[PDB]
């Protein structure tokens, strides 16, 4: 059985949203804790003095539900590495605010994107939240296998996509991650949420992630092919990647809208259960070793 989550960026009513998601068979919901478009000002009047509540109430869910069913998401307007000083400062204050609300809610995990090369100040703000107060939330860094710049359609007449091999360049998002966790001092609380695209990179790029703390794999509905009966399926190569991820016992995250509209949403989940049930059974050694994976012991 797979542990799965639903990634949503639009949650009109939490209780209605969680219920719908859980009926579909998901174990958790990744959602914004402040409205993703609700940009807040911290320095300049009059906007810094904006009234009313800044977000929805913690009273909307039981404490058990916040602790178990909700993965917080950082607002997409928060840019701590912006080239604009005012944007950097508002982002720092907004990032601390969102992280602190997450810690207030007792969220098991919180998603932060690694979507560019320089994340120095995002790492400084996270490292500072980690050393402030008493909390133990996991931080899941959302990082793509292939950078959006490297998978764009070759449709810009005067800015063509490079057809030549860039061995180290195709591994760039691993370096985004490596630099981020080096800055943060290998904190046990910082993990990878690996995002999977329609076109898989070459093997060496995938193998770069071997030995990395992958806690989740993000599967967009758009990467799924359609079978004879209209159900979402994966290419033999994506299936190969899923089998490796299931061995690591990652939590799967389904992102985007239903692109298999004629069929129900849980079909994406059903396909993952199918792959999970259709993997090789554990041999005598594998059944014995269960629970000992990466568990350090003193030699007898």
């Amino acid at each position: 059985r797979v542990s799965s989550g639903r990634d949503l960026n639009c949650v009109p009513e939490i209780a209605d949203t969680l219920g719908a998601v859980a009926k579909q068979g998901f174990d958790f919901l990744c959602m914004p804790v402040f409205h993703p478009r609700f940009k807040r000002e911290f320095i300049q009047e009059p906007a810094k003095n904006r009234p009313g509540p800044q977000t929805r109430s913690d009273l909307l869910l039981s404490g058990r539900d916040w602790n178990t069913l909700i993965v917080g998401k950082l607002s997409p307007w928060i840019r701590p590495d912006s080239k604009v000083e005012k944007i950097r400062r508002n982002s720092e204050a907004a990032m601390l605010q969102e992280l602190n609300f997450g810690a207030y809610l007792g969220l098991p995990a919180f998603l932060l994107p690694l979507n560019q090369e320089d994340n120095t100040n995002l790492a400084r703000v996270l490292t500072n939240h980690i050393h402030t107060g008493h909390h133990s939330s996991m931080f899941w860094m959302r990082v793509p296998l292939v950078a959006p710049e490297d998978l764009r359609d070759d449709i810009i007449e005067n800015a063509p996509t490079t057809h030549t091999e860039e061995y180290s360049g195709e591994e760039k998002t691993w370096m985004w991650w490596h630099n981020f966790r080096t800055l943060c001092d290998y904190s046990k609380r910082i993990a990878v949420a690996l995002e999977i695209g329609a076109d898989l990179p070459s093997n060496h790029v995938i193998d770069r992630w071997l030995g990395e703390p992958i806690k989740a794999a993000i599967l967009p509905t758009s990467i799924f092919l359609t079978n004879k009966k209209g159900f979402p399926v994966l290419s033999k190569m994506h299936q190969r990647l899923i089998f490796r991820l299931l061995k690591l016992e990652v939590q799967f995250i389904i992102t985007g809208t239903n692109h298999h509209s004629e069929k129900e949403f849980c079909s994406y989940l059903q396909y993952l259960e199918y792959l999970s049930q259709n993997r090789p059974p554990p041999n005598a050694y594998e059944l014995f070793a269960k629970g000992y994976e990466d568990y350090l012991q003193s030699p007898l």
């Binding site: 409205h35 609700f38 300049q44 009313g52 977000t55 959006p148 764009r152 359609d153 070759d154 449709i155």
Partner: protein
């Protein structure tokens, strides 16, 4: 009048129709419920008072942007990932949903009707730009030209294959769908707003995240530090020689001339200025909406 009992605090959009009726779009960006609403005021002075609207309707999610589709249609950019078409009933007393298509994988941020008025273009946080056939209610083409969130899309006033896009990947793209490679890169600080010049076919203006407004010619740049923060919108006046309204997150409104020089300034808004619309009846009257729930009617000198 069959409309919701109360409209949401965060006014996102304001657009006058050729007769002078005012279209409003709102979202609740805080509190328990994060939904939205579409409103029509045949009496714009009554706005935003719900008990004095001509028609009003509640949407499932927030209104990130909207546009008129002729005189009766209302195209909506939804937080849900949907692009929705709504239409005023034959009595203009009810806003009825025509289509709700979930084609985008994240918030639909920007929406624009092409010159023919038969097709539209959407932009999203999912990094894609889509071309819609409004009568068939389908996506004709989907484009992943960008490497980050699509901030703004603006259809050419007069060319049905031409549009602009700008994004957090620092690209401004000029599109011509007749081309095998439809996008072309034009050309700093991130581009946040776009407006084609109403008279000069090859001229457009763009706003940036640092408060700068720029004048750009395709065939061939003029620039001014208009705002202290992000330029949210740019709307040219309906005059023979247009005036240019700029709105920002600095909570101000500036009305500029052909040389980008400031003629008018308003600090009426207590929160972010979201949309501006020039009156089709009184060319000196400009209406702005903001997150402070104010509908301000400005008299421009």
């Amino acid at each position: 009048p069959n409309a919701p009992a109360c409209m949401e605090r965060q006014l996102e959009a304001a657009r006058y129709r050729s007769d002078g009726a005012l279209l409003l779009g709102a979202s609740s960006l805080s509190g328990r419920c994060w939904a939205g609403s579409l409103w029509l005021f045949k009496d714009p002075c009554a706005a935003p008072n719900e008990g004095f609207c001509s028609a009003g309707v509640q949407t499932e999610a927030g209104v990130a942007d909207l546009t008129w589709v002729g005189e009766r249609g209302i195209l909506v950019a939804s937080d849900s990932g949907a692009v929705e078409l709504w239409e005023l009933d034959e009595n203009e007393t009810l806003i009825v949903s025509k289509f709700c298509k979930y084609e985008h994988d994240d918030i639909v941020s920007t929406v624009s009707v092409l010159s023919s008025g038969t097709q539209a273009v959407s932009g999203s946080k999912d990094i894609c730009i889509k071309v819609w056939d409004l009568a068939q209610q389908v996506v004709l083409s989907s484009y992943r030209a960008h490497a980050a969130q699509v901030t703004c899309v603006a259809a050419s006033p007069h060319k049905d294959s031409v549009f602009l896009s700008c994004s957090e990947d620092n690209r401004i793209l000029l599109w011509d769908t007749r081309c095998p490679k439809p996008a072309s890169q034009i050309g700093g600080y991130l581009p946040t707003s776009l407006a084609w010049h109403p008279q000069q076919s090859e001229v457009f203006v763009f706003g940036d995240e640092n408060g700068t407004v720029s004048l750009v010619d395709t065939k061939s740049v003029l620039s001014s530090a208009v705002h202290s923060q992000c330029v949210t919108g740019l709307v040219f006046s309906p005059h023979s020689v247009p005036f240019l309204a700029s709105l920002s997150e600095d909570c101000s409104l500036a009305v500029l001339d052909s040389s980008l020089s400031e003629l008018f300034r308003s600090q009426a808004h207590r929160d972010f200025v979201r949309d501006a619309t020039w009156s089709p009846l009184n060319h000196s009257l400009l209406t702005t909406v903001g997150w402070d729930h104010q509908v301000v009617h400005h008299v421009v000198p």
